[PDB]
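User: structure tokens for Lipase B, please.
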Amino acid sequence: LPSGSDPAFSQPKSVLDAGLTCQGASPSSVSKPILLVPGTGTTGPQSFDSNWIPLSTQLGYTPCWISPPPFMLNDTQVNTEYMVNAITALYAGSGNNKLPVLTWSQGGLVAQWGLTFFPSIRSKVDRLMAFAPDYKGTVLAGPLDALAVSAPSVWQQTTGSALTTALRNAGGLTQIVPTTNLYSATDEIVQPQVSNSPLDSSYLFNGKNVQAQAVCGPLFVIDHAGSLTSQFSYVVGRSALRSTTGQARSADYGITDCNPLPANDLTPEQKVAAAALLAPAAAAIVAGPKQNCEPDLMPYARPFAVGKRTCSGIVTP
Ligand SMILES: *[C@@H]1O[C@H](CO)[C@@H](O[C@@H]2O[C@H](CO)[C@@H](O)[C@H](O)[C@H]2NC(C)=O)[C@H](O)[C@H]1NC(C)=O
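Assistant: Done. Predicted tokens:
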């Protein structure tokens, strides 16, 4: 892992702070915060209003989130600036207490990029609860890239990308704080996820890696959104948030929690919104920025992806 100083942010802290909020509180004075990091094509409320905002509130936290603009489609490295700044602010605002981070899709890649390249935060994050995290990117983005219709972060979330290379070469595929990864083989957005093994995009070494089919059997189906929103996902998430080890515990869930429907506690309307979650995010993707090349790596990450190709050409030391 990188050690040393946090890199400077490319955005002003005023801009970063404007991307962060807490439900019914300022980040500078907040009790039991949990930072939520949203998925590609969404803001915090869009990823989470149907699920972990009311679920995490009902578990006794104050939900905070970031909404890097536009809709998590811009440079993943910039999205991570929002996250790192948030952890610094919320640690201070909760009395210098460590806080959990809970994520969906890109949000987990963001958290892990943060922990990897901004060391100051490793001591401020309690645990990471990642749903369908794409630490290795996804193979599904490749063809879009080839047509130059991919957003900046979609390029970066491509299997083989300069960004995913850099993460793994800096040690980022090993958990850095106690981490639980809940994911599914039957994910239509993030693949590969089928091995129940280190090959899977959601796997971190020494993490609590929970492929839902490994617990629920090979005919259990939750998709990319259901990975976040299901009753089985809630049980695992709850376990991870409550656990004195910082990871979910096999003792806390079993066969009888293998309900693929949205989390029981959610309102009828939240359940309808949860089941429809992928539709607005795909629409935001389609409407957002698009380019013909992967955004450059920021100087701090270039030594870790020598030889990959970005907008300015081939990455050098
Ligand atoms: C998405 O990212 C692009 C590229 O970084 C941003 O476009 C730049 O924005 C800065 C700061 O506002 C401008 O000074 C540059 O001239 C822009 N460069 C471009 C278009 O190549 C864009 O602002 C970002 N989008 C959002 C919504 O924040």
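User: Anything notable?

Assistant: The chain is about 35% helix and 10% strand.
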